[PDB]
Amino acid sequence: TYSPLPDDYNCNVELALTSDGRTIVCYHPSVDIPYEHTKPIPHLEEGPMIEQLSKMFFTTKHRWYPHGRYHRCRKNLNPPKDR
């Protein structure tokens, strides 16, 4: 009955060794979210605009100001995509 961690949020975990004791194996099927643990489904100018979207996105006003042409040209237009 003893368990090392609560097996109720991520996966039902159990460890196991071969009888010789040279390799360790694990069995961790993911938990099933019960139905009880769910819910039913159902202009302006620079000053006012930069602060209201900052209050909307929860960030500062600095990054929203426009940068110079020096940085706009240095931005890469064909960046490499992974996968």
| Residues in touch with other proteins (CB under 8 A) | 1-2, 4-5, 10-11, 13-19, 21-30, 32-33, 35, 41-42, 58-60, 62, 83
| DSSP string for residues in 24-78 | EEEE-PBPP--STTS-------HHHHHHHHHHHHT--STTTSPPPHHHHHHS-SS
Which one, 16 or 44, has the nearer CB to other proteins?
16
Q: What's the closest the beta carbon of residue 78 comes to other proteins, in angstroms?
A: 19
Which one, 43 or 68, has the nearer CB to other proteins?
68
